[PDB]
Design a protein around this ligand. Structure first.
Ligand code: HEM
Ligand code: HEM
Ligand SMILES: [O]
Ligand SMILES: [O]
Ligand SMILES: [Zn+2]
Ligand SMILES: [Zn+2]
Ligand SMILES: [Zn+2]
Ligand SMILES: [Zn+2]
Ligand SMILES: [Zn+2]
Lengths: 153, 153
């Protein structure tokens, strides 16, 4: 995994990419296509491009480069944001409050029953099934953080 | 995982929880503490509370319940948002263009070499190690979506 600090280094480095996204995008696809010519074969738009000079002159290659780095930036920002909520809760619950992972299942069951009780209009058998799965996914993600911090279970 | 429909049921339910004029956080913790007395022992603030009346009378238990539901809401929203940016890329790259994970590794290496080239001062061995790990995490998350769609690495 990455620490708090490492995710912030990644987002700071991505700040630099985003500052010249056109140039960064072009150079990434030129590097990909010159380093690994086989990757060209996936692209109807580009598979006939032979040289770095031909690639630097391609307006469509520059546009596609921007699209790739924009999408990757969005995915890394959302990954980092999830980790940023997750890690502090795992860290406090595992190292300070000393909560075993199994207790997260008990509070998950309690949250489901209180939602059902208080909001039955908003929370049917479908919503309850979906919420049960969502809280299991949450527990799996905290459990992964627990493992990194030296707790299994 | 959850379908797009299931995630929206969960996020819609959580919209209502966040709206709650009367916090149901207290009732969650009372239900947790009455069903699992072991969990009560982990709270220095509350482990002495014996009766539902003592629990219902606790100012700090009411406050803490709200804190729990706010944090869980935020973590589920960011989990859903990560899946939502991941899934469309996995969909197109797995089922239509059939991009192998090794080609995602090639573009990952290409991004690293362009960053090194353009930012020799701005991007040291630590920043490079952090970025290399972040792109591997991205590839692992896409690979997991590939598996769900029936496309191999
Ligand atoms: C960080 C890695 C990658 C990102 C973020 C990314 C992102 C995108 C995005 C946002 C699109 C446009 C929407 C779509 O059709 O799905 C796209 C299209 C495409 N990607 Fe990727 N991609 C990546 C890696 C790759 C690699 C390594 C290849 C091939 C070796 C590839 C081949 C394609 C192709 C063929 C298209 C369709 C292009 C067209 O419109 O003609 N992608 N990619
Ligand atoms: C959905 C599950 C949970 C969420 C979202 C959650 C959230 C929080 C938050 C936001 C805090 C305050 C900041 C912090 O120390 O991290 C906190 C504190 C705490 N949590 Fe949890 N928690 C959860 C489950 C549990 C469970 C199951 C236990 C115990 C059985 C527990 C015990 C504690 C304790 C002892 C504290 C310190 C309370 C204080 O004295 O102020 N948590 N929790
Ligand atoms: O791409
Ligand atoms: O908590
Ligand atoms: Zn991710
Ligand atoms: Zn409520
Ligand atoms: Zn309510
Ligand atoms: Zn119990
Ligand atoms: Zn998660």
């Amino acid at each position: 995994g990455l620490s708090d600090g490492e995710w912030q280094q990644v987002l700071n480095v991505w700040g630099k990419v985003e500052a010249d996204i056109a140039g960064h995008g072009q150079e990434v696809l030129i590097r990909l296509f010159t380093g690994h010519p086989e990757t060209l074969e996936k692209f109807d738009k580009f598979k006939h491009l032979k040289t770095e000079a031909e690639m630097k002159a391609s307006e469509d290659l520059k546009k596609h480069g921007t699209v790739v780095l924009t999408a990757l930036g969005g995915i890394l920002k959302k990954h980092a944001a999830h980790e940023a909520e997750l890690k502090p809760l795992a860290q406090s619950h595992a190292t300070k409050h000393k909560i075993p992972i199994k207790y997260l299942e008990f509070i998950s069951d309690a949250i489901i029953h209180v939602l059902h009780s208080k909001h039955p209009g908003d929370f049917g058998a479908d919503a309850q099934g979906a919420m049960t799965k969502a809280l299991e996914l949450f527990r799996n993600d905290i459990a992964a953080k627990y493992k990194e911090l030296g707790f299994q279970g």
